[PDB]
Amino acid sequence: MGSAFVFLEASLELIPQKIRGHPAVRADAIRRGKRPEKILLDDSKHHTAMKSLEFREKRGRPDIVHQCLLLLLDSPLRDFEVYVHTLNGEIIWVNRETRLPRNYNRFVGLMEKLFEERRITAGDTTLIEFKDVGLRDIVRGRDVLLFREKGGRFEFSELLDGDVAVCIGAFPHGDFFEETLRELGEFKEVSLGTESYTSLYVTSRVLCEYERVRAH
Amino acid sequence: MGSAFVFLEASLELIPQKIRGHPAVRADAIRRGKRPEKILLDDSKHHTAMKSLEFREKRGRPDIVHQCLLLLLDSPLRDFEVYVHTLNGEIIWVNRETRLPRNYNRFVGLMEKLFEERRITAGDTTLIEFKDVGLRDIVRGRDVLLFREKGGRFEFSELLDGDVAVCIGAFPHGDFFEETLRELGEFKEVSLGTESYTSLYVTSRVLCEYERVRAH
Numbered sequence: 157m158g159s160a161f162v163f164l165e166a167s168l169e170l171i172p173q174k175i176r177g178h179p180a181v182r183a184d185a186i187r188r189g190k191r192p193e194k195i196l197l198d199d200s201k202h203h204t205a206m207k208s209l210e211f212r213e214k215r216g217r218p219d220i221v222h223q224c225l226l227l228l229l230d231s232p233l234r235d236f237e238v239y240v241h242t243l244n245g246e247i248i249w250v251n252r253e254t255r256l257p258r259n260y261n262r263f264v265g266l267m268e269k270l271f272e273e274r275r276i277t278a279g280d281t282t283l284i285e286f287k288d289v290g291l292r293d294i295v296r297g298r299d300v301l302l303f304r305e306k307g308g309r310f311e312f313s314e315l316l317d318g319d320v321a322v323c324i325g326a327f328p329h330g331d332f333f334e335e336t337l338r339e340l341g342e343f344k345e346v347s348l349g350t351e352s353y354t355s356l357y358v359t360s361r362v363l364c365e366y367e368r369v370r371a372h
Numbered sequence: 373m374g375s376a377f378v379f380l381e382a383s384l385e386l387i388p389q390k391i392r393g394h395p396a397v398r399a400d401a402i403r404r405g406k407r408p409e410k411i412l413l414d415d416s417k418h419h420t421a422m423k424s425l426e427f428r429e430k431r432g433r434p435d436i437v438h439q440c441l442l443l444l445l446d447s448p449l450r451d452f453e454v455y456v457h458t459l460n461g462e463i464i465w466v467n468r469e470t471r472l473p474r475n476y477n478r479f480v481g482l483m484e485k486l487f488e489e490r491r492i493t494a495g496d497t498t499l500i501e502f503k504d505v506g507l508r509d510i511v512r513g514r515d516v517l518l519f520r521e522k523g524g525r526f527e528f529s530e531l532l533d534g535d536v537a538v539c540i541g542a543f544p545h546g547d548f549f550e551e552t553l554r555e556l557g558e559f560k561e562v563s564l565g566t567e568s569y570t571s572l573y574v575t576s577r578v579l580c581e582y583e584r585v586r587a588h
């Protein structure tokens with residue numbers, strides 16, 4: 157039932173209710189020509205409005221998952237599914253054949269449309285859609301590999317054997333929520349080295365190892 | 373004298389003179405709060421003004437080199453220099469230690485500042501600067517490896533031996549200008565496979581092979 161890549165705690169959400177009246181948000185609403193509740197949170201635009209938010213260090217960074225998805229979906233290997241788990245626990249499925257906008261502003265608009273319409277389609281074919289399941293459900297039947305600095309050292313030919321779920325954080329700061337780790341069930345923690353790497357770099361390195369083994 | 377990565381024909385330029393009076397450009401100038409001549413060409417904003425441009429299929433795509441630079445500079449391996457050759461033949465040197473903005477709009481602003489001021493600095497240290505040389509000069513003393521689909525099949529341990537210049541196009545469509553190829557001098561053409569891949573994917577794959585050999 158195949159492998160999957162799952163981006164965890166992706167920094168992807170609409171502007172939270174309680175900051176929608178802030179001047180920085182109202183100003184962006186005017187510039188964008190739509191209501192605050194429809195706009196994706198982006199700390200390059202909304203920073204001054206975000207002071208009161210919980211876990212703020214994780215929030216307002218849709219650029220991270222944008223770039224990771226672009227690279228991953230550019231792979232010529234088509235034997236995996238792609239999911240995005242958001243900071244708020246929502247599950248988005250991305251059809252392996254989806255061509256995402258390469259321009260960040262166009263990506264943001266597409267994500268806004270996704271949050272509004274709940275699915276993006278090519279006629280009868282679904283390209284991107286929220287699923288009414290949790291993180292625990294998309295890792296069913298797959299060996300979960302959680303990439304974290306504190307993890308262990310393993311041979312990739314062994315790691316990327318059968319059906320795997322490659323799980324990489326897509327947020328800029330902090331550690332995984334305890335809830336996220338509980339949802340993963342059984343998992344193996346895998347480290348690439350003694351330093352904190354970016355989501356994009358980890359995606360790149362893991363994709364390369366994955367293709368080495370599996371394309372093969 | 374070390375290896376280098378060179379992004380070729382990067383789609384990075386200010387709005388050309390002859391389209392500065394177009395309504396789409398004047399509208400963006402108002403939104404940005406500065407003169408057309410200072411604004412980076414971006415076909416997600418300026419498409420309708422670009423109809424009369426030569427080699428238009430290559431132009432207005434700074435997102436491509438943005439993402440490739442982010443990934444490359446995220447590498448933990450510090451034994452290489454980084455250059456960007458633009459569509460107009462300009463040479464930009466990027467200090468290996470530079471942290472580029474991850475947000476595309478902030479990157480665009482930094483590139484606009486670079487074109488205006490000609491250098492970006494951390495006090496006395498240069499982070500990014502135009503160099504008064506040509507493409508032929510930055511590949512002096514290095515084995516040029518030009519990544520193209522029509523190239524040959526080689527072992528990477530042999531390819532990435534001594535001082536190399538890894539050259540990857542950073543434009544969306546078309547083929548290299550003949551002038552660009554002439555500037556490279558002696559070079560080996562290297563193919564990754566029988567398909568056209570994105571700049572980001574090629575950067576990722578080559579970086580991974582480079583690190584395998586050299587980090588080692």
Ligand SMILES: N[C@@H](Cc1ccc(O)cc1)C(=O)O
Pocket residue numbers: 308309347348349350
């Ligand atoms: N690439 C590292 C692997 C590693 C991973 C985590 C560590 O804590 C240490 C080492 C090496 O070969 O050394």
Ligand SMILES: N[C@@H](Cc1ccc(O)cc1)C(=O)O
Pocket residue numbers: 524525563564565566
């Ligand atoms: N990765 C390819 C290499 C290749 C490159 C260019 C080609 O035209 C063909 C094959 C392989 O192992 O088959």
